[PDB]
Design an enzyme around this catalytic site. Sequence first.
Site, PDB file in Angstrom:
ATOM      1  N   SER A  62       5.532   0.596   9.101  1.00  0.00           N
ATOM      2  CA  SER A  62       6.519   1.095   7.390  1.00  0.00           C
ATOM      3  C   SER A  62       7.952   1.317   8.331  1.00  0.00           C
ATOM      4  O   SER A  62       8.528   1.873   7.593  1.00  0.00           O
ATOM      5  CB  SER A  62       5.837   2.600   7.525  1.00  0.00           C
ATOM      6  OG  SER A  62       4.421   2.135   7.134  1.00  0.00           O
ATOM      7  N   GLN A 118      -1.850   4.512   0.571  1.00  0.00           N
ATOM      8  CA  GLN A 118      -2.353   3.414   0.784  1.00  0.00           C
ATOM      9  C   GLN A 118      -2.648   2.908  -0.614  1.00  0.00           C
ATOM     10  O   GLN A 118      -3.159   3.782  -2.014  1.00  0.00           O
ATOM     11  CB  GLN A 118      -3.331   2.852   1.341  1.00  0.00           C
ATOM     12  CG  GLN A 118      -3.517   2.710   3.039  1.00  0.00           C
ATOM     13  CD  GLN A 118      -2.056   2.569   3.232  1.00  0.00           C
ATOM     14  OE1 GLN A 118      -1.460   2.316   2.719  1.00  0.00           O
ATOM     15  NE2 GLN A 118      -2.287   2.792   4.755  1.00  0.00           N
ATOM     16  N   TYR A 148       3.503  11.330   1.683  1.00  0.00           N
ATOM     17  CA  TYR A 148       4.503  10.220   2.031  1.00  0.00           C
ATOM     18  C   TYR A 148       3.806   8.932   1.695  1.00  0.00           C
ATOM     19  O   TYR A 148       1.897   9.012   1.941  1.00  0.00           O
ATOM     20  CB  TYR A 148       4.713   9.532   3.851  1.00  0.00           C
ATOM     21  CG  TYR A 148       5.149   8.647   4.146  1.00  0.00           C
ATOM     22  CD1 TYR A 148       6.559   8.379   4.500  1.00  0.00           C
ATOM     23  CD2 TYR A 148       4.002   7.780   4.785  1.00  0.00           C
ATOM     24  CE1 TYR A 148       6.504   6.671   4.981  1.00  0.00           C
ATOM     25  CE2 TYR A 148       4.432   6.438   5.113  1.00  0.00           C
ATOM     26  CZ  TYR A 148       5.514   6.521   5.463  1.00  0.00           C
ATOM     27  OH  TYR A 148       5.679   4.895   6.720  1.00  0.00           O
ATOM     28  N   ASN A 150       2.749   4.640   0.712  1.00  0.00           N
ATOM     29  CA  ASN A 150       3.166   3.298   0.151  1.00  0.00           C
ATOM     30  C   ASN A 150       3.776   2.911  -1.090  1.00  0.00           C
ATOM     31  O   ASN A 150       4.008   2.080  -1.636  1.00  0.00           O
ATOM     32  CB  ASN A 150       2.692   1.977   1.121  1.00  0.00           C
ATOM     33  CG  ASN A 150       2.457   2.178   2.383  1.00  0.00           C
ATOM     34  OD1 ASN A 150       3.324   2.554   2.929  1.00  0.00           O
ATOM     35  ND2 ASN A 150       1.302   2.417   3.162  1.00  0.00           N
ATOM     36  N   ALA A 316       3.549   1.680  11.521  1.00  0.00           N
ATOM     37  CA  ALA A 316       2.705   1.220  12.475  1.00  0.00           C
ATOM     38  C   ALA A 316       2.103   0.399  10.953  1.00  0.00           C
ATOM     39  O   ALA A 316       1.922  -0.047  10.269  1.00  0.00           O
ATOM     40  CB  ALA A 316       1.692   2.140  12.467  1.00  0.00           C
ATOM     41  N   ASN A 341      -0.664   0.109  18.497  1.00  0.00           N
ATOM     42  CA  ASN A 341      -0.677   1.674  17.379  1.00  0.00           C
ATOM     43  C   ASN A 341      -1.077   2.929  18.292  1.00  0.00           C
ATOM     44  O   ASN A 341      -1.591   3.044  18.191  1.00  0.00           O
ATOM     45  CB  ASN A 341      -1.358   1.551  16.226  1.00  0.00           C
ATOM     46  CG  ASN A 341      -0.754   2.758  15.116  1.00  0.00           C
ATOM     47  OD1 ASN A 341       0.364   3.513  15.307  1.00  0.00           O
ATOM     48  ND2 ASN A 341      -1.792   2.489  14.202  1.00  0.00           N
TER      49      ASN A 341
HETATM   50  C1  LIG Z   1       3.675   3.277   8.357  1.00  0.00           C
HETATM   51  O1  LIG Z   1       3.857   2.715   8.924  1.00  0.00           O
HETATM   52  C2  LIG Z   1       2.104   3.222   7.511  1.00  0.00           C
HETATM   53  N1  LIG Z   1       1.417   1.753   7.707  1.00  0.00           N
HETATM   54  C3  LIG Z   1       0.961   1.316   6.950  1.00  0.00           C
HETATM   55  O2  LIG Z   1       0.697   1.411   5.606  1.00  0.00           O
HETATM   56  C4  LIG Z   1       0.661   0.264   7.037  1.00  0.00           C
HETATM   57  C5  LIG Z   1      -1.124  -0.479   7.862  1.00  0.00           C
HETATM   58  C6  LIG Z   1      -1.775  -2.124   7.866  1.00  0.00           C
HETATM   59  C7  LIG Z   1      -2.644  -1.559   8.320  1.00  0.00           C
HETATM   60  C8  LIG Z   1      -3.557  -0.266   8.911  1.00  0.00           C
HETATM   61  S1  LIG Z   1      -1.599   0.307   9.069  1.00  0.00           S
HETATM   62  C9  LIG Z   1       1.183   4.553   8.286  1.00  0.00           C
HETATM   63  N2  LIG Z   1       0.337   3.831   9.442  1.00  0.00           N
HETATM   64  C10 LIG Z   1      -0.485   4.576  10.427  1.00  0.00           C
HETATM   65  C11 LIG Z   1      -1.007   3.899  11.126  1.00  0.00           C
HETATM   66  O3  LIG Z   1      -1.967   4.864  12.331  1.00  0.00           O
HETATM   67  O4  LIG Z   1      -1.543   2.725  10.867  1.00  0.00           O
HETATM   68  C12 LIG Z   1      -1.783   5.829   8.953  1.00  0.00           C
HETATM   69  C13 LIG Z   1      -2.689   6.640   9.972  1.00  0.00           C
HETATM   70  O5  LIG Z   1      -3.493   6.848   8.681  1.00  0.00           O
HETATM   71  C14 LIG Z   1      -3.730   8.115   8.642  1.00  0.00           C
HETATM   72  C15 LIG Z   1      -4.964   8.304   7.520  1.00  0.00           C
HETATM   73  O6  LIG Z   1      -4.369   8.705   9.738  1.00  0.00           O
HETATM   74  C16 LIG Z   1      -1.207   6.092   8.181  1.00  0.00           C
HETATM   75  S2  LIG Z   1      -0.301   4.595   7.428  1.00  0.00           S
END
Ligand SMILES: *C(=O)[C@@H](NC(=O)Cc1cccs1)[C@@H]1NC(C(=O)O)=C(COC(C)=O)CS1
EC number: 3.5.2.6
Length: 359
Positions: A62, A118, A148, A150, A316, A341
């Site tokens: 992100s 998402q 927040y 995407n 992440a 991560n």
């Molecule tokens: C932003 O960094 C975001 N990442 C994404 O949406 C992109 C991804 C693609 C595959 C996996 S994440 C946030 N990252 C994460 C994480 O820890 O990876 C999130 C954790 O989600 C929950 C629910 O706890 C939220 S989306």
Amino acid sequence: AAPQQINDIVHRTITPLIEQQKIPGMAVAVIYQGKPYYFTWGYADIAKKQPVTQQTLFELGSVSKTFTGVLGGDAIARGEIKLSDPTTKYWPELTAKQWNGITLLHLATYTAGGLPLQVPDEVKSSSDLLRFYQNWQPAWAPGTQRLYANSSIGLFGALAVKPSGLSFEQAMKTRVFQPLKLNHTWINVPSAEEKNYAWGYREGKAVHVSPGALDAEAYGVKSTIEDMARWVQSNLKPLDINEKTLQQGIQLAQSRYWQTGDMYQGLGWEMLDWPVNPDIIINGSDNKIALAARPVKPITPPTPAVRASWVHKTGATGGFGSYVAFIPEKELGIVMLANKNYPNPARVAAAWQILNALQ
Ligand SMILES: *C(=O)[C@@H](NC(=O)Cc1cccs1)[C@@H]1NC(C(=O)O)=C(COC(C)=O)CS1
């Protein structure tokens, strides 16, 4: 080499972080008085024993949203869009009544009223996306809650480039990456650069981010520690940027559009007044807070970018964790890229310990 104070605080902070979090590979840049200092640890590919280098590509996750916010700012400065424009001006097929009153500002700042974190994995084509957004029912009126998402800023990025006539990727390359000489920053890693693309590691397994709708806009950029240091430099000191609309877009992305608690929402970037309470930024970066819906207060007009700010963004993917933070008044910044991560609060605590020691 770097000033010994930088080497000292970085070694003392990052070394235990890597050991406690079991991070396989990590790259750090400190931007100090506007100049970059680089540090690398560990492996980009564990099984193949490939070390992290200054040319290793990491998934930014992100942190990609900061590029999207600046590209949107550049479009505003070009006169191509306005944040008060209705979403339907750029996507007239979005006819469902709940879209009346949702502006580009709301999309860019996660305030449209509950667009989800998402885009569903089942949503792949533009027809799927249209059905998704037409069926979505808001939980809240626009401009009242920040959630927040995407699916919110991702749509902002896709629509913000429509007047240009360019694809999102082409607009990003032509209007942001190329003027800033980010020559190793990619939405799609070319075949010839795959040797530099680190593997991410999740539960000990090597992984890369999977394709998804609006991925480029929300979480899909890959970059090196050198390009990311240059990105920080550019956002620290936009007056050195020759392309006027990009200079202005960088400034607009650090304008303060909404307040919740002590944080301010920019375009991609988030900001707090400096000096910060470290507990507020550390605890606020935990997903328990960072992903929660929070009530917002509008700032009308948006506050022009404040130099005495902590400006930051975490990111992440399944296999990577990234963090960027900088303080324009101090000409100081940090980038931390890792191929695991690991928890957001550990990233923020380490970054604050380093920057606070160098202020
Ligand atoms: C932003 O960094 C975001 N990442 C994404 O949406 C992109 C991804 C693609 C595959 C996996 S994440 C946030 N990252 C994460 C994480 O820890 O990876 C999130 C954790 O989600 C929950 C629910 O706890 C939220 S989306």
